[model samples]
Target: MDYTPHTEEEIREMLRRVGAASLEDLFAHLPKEILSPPIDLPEPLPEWKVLEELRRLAAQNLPAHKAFLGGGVRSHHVPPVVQALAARGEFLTAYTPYQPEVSQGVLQATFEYQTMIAELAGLEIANASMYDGATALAEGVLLALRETGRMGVLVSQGVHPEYRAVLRAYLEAVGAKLLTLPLEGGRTPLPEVGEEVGAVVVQNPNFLGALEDLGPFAEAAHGAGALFVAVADPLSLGVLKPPGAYGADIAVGDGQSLGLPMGFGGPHFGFLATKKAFVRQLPGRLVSETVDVEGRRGFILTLQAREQYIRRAKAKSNITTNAQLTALMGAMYLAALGPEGLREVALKSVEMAHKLHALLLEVPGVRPFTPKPFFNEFALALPKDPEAVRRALAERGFHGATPVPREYGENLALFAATELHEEEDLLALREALKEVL
Candidate 1:
C-alpha cells in the first residue's frame, strides 16, 4: 500500500536480470556532450522551499498582459465552472474507461464530447480524441487511404506547416504518395484529384487565417473518387461554415482553442470527425448508449471492430489511450459558452484582429502581405528585418510575432489576436512597431 515493496537488493537483481549493468547504462547511448556530469545534489528541501523555487523559475518567464500570440492556441476567457467541474477527481483521473459498467460517468462524458464535436463540425461521427491537430491530420490521411485503398494524398500548403510536416513523416513510413498543393491568395488551390488519390487535406481559416469555403474542392475530390478532409480551428467553427456541411468526408482540428491553455504549445487534444459510414474506420474509442440485460440504460464502448486491441495490424488506428481529461475540459467549455457565447468570442477575435491589422498598416513600413479576408491571424511585410523588429518589441515587453522566413519568406511576420487583447496592448504594439520602424 505504501508502494515501497521493492528493496535496493531487489532493484539490483532486477536490473541484472534485465541485462542492464546500472541505471546510468540505460542512457549510455546518449551523446556525451549533451549528458550532464554527476552532480552533488542537495538533500531534500522543505515543501515550501520547493514551491518557492518553482515560483521563482516561473516568474522569470514573460506573462501575457494582453497576449495576441495565436498560431493555433488562443488566449480566451475560460469560465471558472469549467475548471471546477473538470478538476473533480472522477473526471481528472479517469483513463480509458476500459470497463464501462463502473465507468458510466466517464463513458457518458466521452460520448457527449463526441456528440457535441460532431454537431459543431457538422460531421456524422466523432472519435474520442487524438494526440493533437498535427497527428490527427496524419491519421485522417491514413483513414482515407484505408477506406479508399489509394496511395496518393493531396495536402494543402495553406494547412499548418507543422501539421503538414507530420503528415509527410507518416506518409514516408506508410509509403503513401503525398502531393503538396500550392496556396492561391492564402487558400488551398483546388487540386485535380484522381482515382489514385485517397484524400485531399485542406484547412479552413488556414495557416494564414484565410477563410476558405471547401465546396468546390470537396466536389472535385469526390468526383475523382477521393475523400475530402478539412482541418479547422474549433473556435472558428462558431462563426465560419462547417466542413461537413460543405461535403468534407473527414474533419480534423486542434481542440486547444476551445478551452485549453497554451501550455508552451502542447498537450492539446486533436479531434477527428467523419460521416456515419466512416465511423468504423475512425481512430480511438466510440461510446454508445445502450440497455443492460435488465433493461436499464447504460453506456458502453461500441463499434470497436476497428481498434488495434481488436484487429491489431488490420485496425484503423493504433491510438490506444484517449485524451479523457482534455476532452472533458472541451465539453465543459462548449456547454458553458453554448452557441451564443461562442459566437461572441469568435466575433470579438475577428474584430480585434482587424483592429490590430489596421493599426499595423498605419505604421510607416508595415503593409499587409495577403490582401485576402482572414480570421484572427494575418501576415505583414515589414520594412526592417522582421527578426530584429521582433526583438525590439520583446525588449519593450511585447511578445512579438513569428518570423515568416521559413514559411512565408523573409521580411514578413505573422500576427494574431484574440479576445484577450485590450486597447492599451494594441497601443503598446503600435508604439513598439513605430519605434522599430
Candidate 2:
C-alpha cells in the first residue's frame, strides 16, 4: 500500500473513469477463489513482533564474507550507482508490465539491459534474461533440439557441475540424451561431433580454469550441422573472444559476475544471446521499443506472438522469473564500465590471479594443476585435505577458496582472484597456506 501514492480525489477520478463505484467494484471481476481465498496468514503482528521476527530470520544466515570462490559466480566490485539506481522505488517494487500504460519504465530498463547483454555476447539478439547460467544453457539446448530435430546433446565435462546437473534435469524430463564429452587436461577432448547431435555445448575458461580454443568445437558443430552453444563469463568476454565471434549459434552465461554479490549459492541472472535467425525461439519475455501516437518512444511485452505461452507443449521453454533486478544490475554495471572499463577489470583479475598462482607455487607442498594461460580462477593441487585447508583459512578470518569435490579429484582446491583482492589479501592467503599445508 505504501508503494503506491494517489490522493483521494485522484482515486475518485480514476474510479469514475473506469465505471467503478468503489474499490470492491474495481476488483469484483476477479474469480471468487482468488478474491476470497482461505487465509492461513497470522493475525497482523504489531511493530515489535515484526521487528523481532525479522531479526530472528536474519540471524539464521551468515553475513557475506571474503569468498574468493568462483565456479560459475565470481565476486566483483560493484559500482555504488548500480545499487542506488537498482533499488529506486521505480524498479524495486515493479513487476513485469504486461500493459504499456503501466510498463513503460520496466520495459525501457529491460530493453536497455537486453541491448547491453546482446552487445556483451557479440550476438544480434539477447532475451531480457533467464533463471541463471544453468537454465540459460539448458534453454539453449532446448532450442538446438527443436531447431536441429536431434535427440542428443553433447555437453563438455568442463561446464560448471551445477549447470550440468540443471541441464540434465531439464533434458532428462523430455527424454533427451545428454552425453558427456570427456575432459583431457581440464579441457574438452572434443569428440567426433555428428549430425545426430542436437548441439555441442562447451564452456570457456572451463571448470578448472583452463582456457579453450573454441574454434575447434564450433567447427565440429558446424560441420555436423549441429548448433554450438557456448557458456561464458561476461567479464571474460572483455578479454576473450565472444561466442558469436567464434561462430556459436547460441551463447549463454551467468550475469552474476557482472555486478551481483555472492552471498551464497544465488539467484544470479542468466543471459542467452543468439544469431538473429533464432530470435523467435529464445525463451522468456522479450521487451521491444515502439512509438505511440504522439511519436514518443515506448516499451511493451512482445510475448503475445510466442506460441509457448499460448501453448507450452510446443514453445521453446516455459521457465519463469528472468532474474529482473540481477539483470538490471548487470546492465548498470556494464554501462558504468564501457568497453575499456570492462577490459580493465578483466585484465586486473587476470594479473591478480597470475600473481597469486606464482606466489602459491613458492609454497613447497602446493602444486598448480590449472596450468599457465588461465583466467581469474584455477585449481591447485593441495598436499592436505582441501576441507581442512579451507577450515584453517577460515580460522585466519578470511573466507577460504572452494574445495573441489572428490569426483573432480583428491586435495584439489579451486582458487579465484578478483579486483577486490589486494596485496594484503595475497599475503594473508599465502601466509595461512604455509602454516596449513
Candidate 3:
C-alpha cells in the first residue's frame, strides 16, 4: 500500500458536505441490476505478469497491411517526434489553459495550432480546438443559426451519414430545423438562393469521395444571406483549394489526419475556423499572441469571455474543455511536415488511391459506383455481398472498406488510401478481392 492519503473519515466528511449519505447513494437512481454488480476485473498481478498479459492480448489482433479502409479516419504516417513531444508529462496531464500567466506554454502551442489551421483553411480566425469533426460541424450550424437569427439549415445529403445524425440530434435538442438537399451524381445540387436559410452545410470530397467544386454552393449560400459551412478532410487541404478561397464562411473538419492514430475512432480533435468578423461567436478557447511587460514574446488566453463558463447563459457556445494536447499534436505534425511535405503526402495518397482503384476495377464483378473525381477514397459496387467480402478480407488479414448501406444503399463499399499504404498492400487487396468474389 503506497500510503493512501484520504482516510475513511475524510471521505465521509467530503460526501457529507456534498449532501450525500454514501458513494452508492450518488448512483441510487440507476437500476440495481445494472449498478449492483461488482466489476469483474482480473485480480492484481505482478508488473511483469501484467506486461506479459497485455502483450498476449495485443498479439491476438491482426495488422491492417492488406486492406483499404477509410471512411472518415485516414491512415497517415505519424512522425516519431510527434509522439515524443505529446508524451511529455506536462502536456499529457495538463488541462485547458484557464489562467494565461501560469499556462503560457500550453497557450502558446494552442495559438500556433490555431494559426496553422487558419492558414490552411484560409480563414481569418481559428478556435483552440473542438471534440471532433462531427461536433465541430454541429457547432458551425449552431453558430450560423445564432448569427443569422434564423432556424432553417440546408444540409447536403452527401455529407457523412454519422455527421448528419449528430447534427440532427443537436438541431432537435435546440428546436432548429434541417432541410436535407438531394445529392445529384454524388454532389450537392445547385439550388437557388433564398433569404430564409441560415446555413448550407456541405462536405468536400464528400462521403462517396467525390471532389466537389464548392464555389457555386458557397455563392448560393452567401447570396441567400446564409453562411456556407464547409466540412473537409484536413489532408486534402494540402493540395486542394482551401474552403475560404472558395468563398466558405466557416471551415470545419477532423484534424486526425494530421499525425493522429485512430484509437478505434475516438479522441480526435475537431477544427473550427472562420473569418475575423465572426471570431466573437466561435466556440471553444482561443489563444492570442502578444508582448509581455518585458517586451518579450508571450501568449495569452484571449476572447474567452465568449465561452460557456465565462458567459453562462449568454455564452455563444457551451463547450468548456478544449482539446489542447491533440491539437498540439496536429500543430507539431503540420510543422514537421510543412507545406511541401504535406503536398508530397497528398500527391502520394492520390497516386496510391488511383492505383488501387485501377487494380480493383480489373477484378471481375467489381466496378466503381461513380466515375467522378475523388481524392483518396471512392465507392464501389460489387457483385458479391459486401459484408461477406469484408469478412473474407478480414480473415485474410486486412480490414476492408466501410459498407455504405446506411447512406449509399446496399452492395456499395467505400475505400480509401493514404501515404501510409504501399503498392504491395493494394496488390494483396486485389488478390483478396479475387478470392472473395
Candidate 4:
C-alpha cells in the first residue's frame, strides 16, 4: 500500500511543499510546444504481428556490395575462431579476477592481450586495455602531463576531430590547455613546441588517411622537453612503421578492426603502450607473469593504478574496468593472423584503396582531396553534397562516401576499403559513384 499509494491530498501537499500553487504550475516552466505533444500511437498488436512488421521494415535496408565507410571504425574480416573461443563460458562470463587462485585463465588472457598490444605498438610495455580509443588518447596526454609537470598540449588538427573534442573536454575538466596545429596539405607539419607544452600528439595515417613523418615531430617534442605521443590504427602498424621506431614516449589507438565488429561505432577496445620505464604511471589494469612458491608459473594483476585499488586522488585514473572481452577477441585475432598474415591484410587493403582511387579519378566531378602516401583510406571531393551522395549510394545497394568532419571542408567524403573487398567490389563502387554524381 505504501509503495503504490499517492492520493489527491498527498499530491496537493507535495506541490505545496515544493512552493507550487497547483499541480499544473509545477510544469509551467516547461516549453509550451512540448506540454501537449500529439501522440498517434497505433493499437497494440500481437507479438507475431509486431515481429512481422519489424521484419518488413528491416528488409527495406539494402545489403551493401561494399561499404566505404572509415572515419574511424571500418569493416574487416573476423575469423570464426575469434568468436568461437571468446564466447566460451569460461571467457564470456569472467569478471575482474581479484583472486589469483581460480582466476589464472583470464589473467593469462589479459597478459597475452598486453603483449600483443605492445608488439603491435612497437613499445616496450602495455596496460591491459581501456574503454575506447578516444578515452585512451586523453588518458595518454594526462600521463604525459603528469610526467612533465606541464599543463599545455600541442595536438595536430589532422588527428580525428572527434578525438580532439574528447581531449578538449578532458583538458577543460582539469584546467589544462590545448593548442591545435593546422594541417598543411592534409598532413600535420612539424610544429614549434612551447615551453608550456607537456606533450605533442599526432596520428599516423591520420584522420585524413595521409601518412605523417613522425620523426620530425618526435625530435621537436624531445628538443622542447615534451613527450611525443602517437595515435595509431593498430592494423596499419602491420605494414607501416610503428611509433616506437620513431621515438614516441607513448603509443595509443583503437583495436576495433582486430576481430571486432564496428557495431555502428562501439563495443571496441583501446590500448596504450610505452617504454618499460613508465609502467608505474600506466592506467587501467596490468597482468604480470610470476612463479609460485612451488615453482609453478602463474599470472596475476599488478600495477593496479585505477581508483578501484587506491585513494581516488592518488590513483592514476578513475577508469574502473578494462574492456576485457573485446580485448581478448583482439588478442585472439592477432594470434591467429600472426605477423605475416597481418601484413598481407594491410597490403591487400592498400592495393584495393589505390585501385578504387584511380578508377574514381576517371569519373567526372571527382578529385583527390589528399595527396599520395596514404594507407587504405582516402579523401575525395564530391560533386554533390556528401550526405546526399551517401544516401544516393546507399539506394544503389552500396555503403560509402562518408563525410569528412566539417573542419576538413564542404562537399568532401572519406572512402575506405579493406582486405575483404575484391576487384569486382571496387569496380562496382566506382560505377555506382559515377551514376550518383
Identify the runs in model 3 with alpha carbons over 4 angstroms from their true place: 1-42, 65-67, 308-316
lDDT of 3 by residue, 116-182 (tens): 9999998898988889999999998888887787778899988888888989988887788888986
Query: lDDT per prediction?
Result: 0.82, 0.83, 0.84, 0.86
lDDT score at residue 333, model 3, on the 0-100 scale: 91
Q: TM-score per candidate, in order? A: 0.88, 0.86, 0.89, 0.86
Per-residue lDDT of candidate 2, residues 1-437 (tens digit): 14469889999999999899988887888887789668798787777888999999989864544466667766688678889989899788887777787778788889998888888888998888998899898888988887777878999988988899999998887778899986776778767987788799999988889898898899999899899999999999998989988899899999888868775766588999988787656678788888898999888878556555323442146775688888988988989898899999899888888888888888988887876668888998888888888888777665656887766667888888887788778777888888877
Query: Per-residue lDDT of 1-437 in model 4, one digit per residue for the tens?
Result: 13458899998899889999987788999998788688898887877888999899878766432478887888888788898999999889977999988999899989998999998999999988988888999989888887777889999998888889988998887788999998888888778998889899999988989998999999999999999999999999998999999999999998887768766686789899998987766778888999888989999998654343323332134667889999899999999999999999999999999998899888899988877889999898888898998999888888999988668876889999889999999899889999988
Q: Identify the candidate with maximal lDDT.
A: 4
lDDT accuracy of residue 320 in candidate 1: 76
- Residue 267 displacement in candidate 1 (angstroms): 3.4
Model 2 accuracy (lDDT, Cα): 0.83
lDDT for model 1, on a 0 to 1 scale?
0.82
Model 1 lDDT tens row, 1-437: 23469888998999999888887887888998778687898777777888999999999988753566667766777667888998899888866787888899998888899998998899988988888899889888888888887889998888888898888988888788989987766667666778999889889987877778799999999999999999999888998899988999999999988868677786588898999998767777788889999999998888777764323332134677767788888988988899888988889888888988889899887878755689989888899887788788888788776666455555877788777777677777888888878
Which pairs of residues have clashing backbones in candidate 2? Answer: none
